[PDB]
Symmetry: C2
Subunit: 129 residues, 2 copies
C-alpha cells in the first residue's frame, strides 16, 4: 500500500562532487537507471539526481565525461516513505520521470523507487488505476 | 487493446553499421531511450536494438564511442502489431526491459512501444490488472 514497502534495495548514491564517468560507473555496477547525489557535509541529504538519460545527452553533446556531474544533475522530486504508492506513480506520470526519490520526514535518503517497481506487479497495478 | 493502437510515432532507427555516438545523437535528437538497428540490405528488418543503458556501459567501460554500435546492441525482443497490449507488458516484466519492438506479420519494423506508454494511462493500467 505504501512507498517503503516497494523498496527493493539500499540507495545507490555518490557525493555531489562526483564526475560524470564516476556516476556512469556506479550506475553500470549496480544495474540501475538513476543515481542520487548526496551532500558533501551530509551524505544522508539528497541534493540532486543523475540519470543515464542525462549521461546520454552528455555523450551526444561531447561534454568532458571526467568533468563534474552536478551541472547535468537535477533537483530531486521526492515522495515520503510513509506516502501511498500511487503518489509515487502519478509524480512519475506528471513529471515524465521513471524514478522518484523516497525520503523520510527528516528529509533523509531512504531509497529510490522506479516505474519498474509499480508496473510489474498485479497487486499494485489494480491500485494505480 | 492492441499494440498498434498505442503507437504514436514513426520508428526511431539507424542502419546496423552505425557507430555508438551516432546512436547517442539519434537518441538525444528524438528524446527516446531506445534505437532500433535495421539491416544493411533491408531497412524494414530490425536486426538489433541499442538503449541509452548500453551507451552508459560503453561510457563506464571507456569504449571507443566512434566504434560500431552492433557489439553493444541486443537481439530484438518483439511483439506483433496485432497482439494485445498485455503481451508487450508481460515481456517487459519477464525480461526486465522497458521497451518492446513492434513488428508486423512479415517481421518488418512497425514501431516501438515503451513502459512509458503502458503505465501512464488509466485505461491501460486497468487492463493490465484484468489480464
Ligand atoms: N538510485 C537507486 N537506488 C536504489 N535502488 C534503485 C535506484 N534506482 C533504481 N533502483 C531500484 O533498482 C531497480 C532497477 O532500477 P532501474 O533500472 O533504474 O529501474 C528498480 O526496481 C528500483 O527499485
Ligand atoms: N526523482 C527525480 N528527481 C528529479 N529529476 C529526475 C528524477 N527522476 C528522473 N529525473 C530526470 O529525468 C530525466 C530522465 O529520468 P529517468 O526517466 O529516471 O531516466 C533525467 O534528466 C533525470 O535527471
Ligand atoms: N525506438 C523508438 N522508435 C519510435 N518510438 C519510440 C522508440 N522508443 C520509444 N518510442 C516512443 O516514444 C516515447 C519515448 O519514450 P522513451 O523512449 O521511453 O523515453 C515512448 O513513450 C514510446 O511510445
Ligand atoms: N525490445 C528489446 N529487445 C532486446 N533488448 C532490449 C529491448 N529493450 C531494451 N533492451 C535491452 O535492455 C537493456 C535496458 O534497456 P531499457 O531499460 O529498455 O532502456 C539494454 O541493454 C537494452 O539493450
Ligand atoms: Cs540540468
Ligand atoms: Cs491521491
Ligand atoms: Cs505531462
Ligand atoms: Cs523530465
Ligand atoms: Cs494511432
Ligand atoms: Cs550486449
Amino acid at each position: 500500500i505504501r512507498t517503503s514497502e516497494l523498496l527493493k534495495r539500499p540507495p545507490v548514491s555518490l557525493p555531489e562532487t562526483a564526475t560524470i564517468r564516476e556516476v556512469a560507473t556506479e550506475l553500470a555496477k549496480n544495474r540501475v537507471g538513476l543515481a542520487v547525489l548526496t551532500a558533501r557535509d551530509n551524505p544522508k541529504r539528497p541534493v540532486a539526481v543523475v540519470s543515464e538519460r542525462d549521461i546520454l545527452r552528455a555523450v551526444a553533446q561531447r561534454l568532458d565525461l571526467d568533468g563534474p556531474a552536478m551541472p547535468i544533475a537535477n533537483s530531486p522530486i521526492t515522495v515520503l516513505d510513509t506516502d501511498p504508492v500511487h503518489v509515487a506513480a502519478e509524480k512519475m506520470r506528471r513529471h515524465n520521470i521513471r524514478h522518484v526519490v523516497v525520503v523520510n520526514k527528516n528529509g533523509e535518503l531512504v531509497g529510490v523507487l522506479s516505474i519498474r517497481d509499480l508496473c510489474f506487479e498485479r497487486a499494485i497495478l489494480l491500485e494505480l488505476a
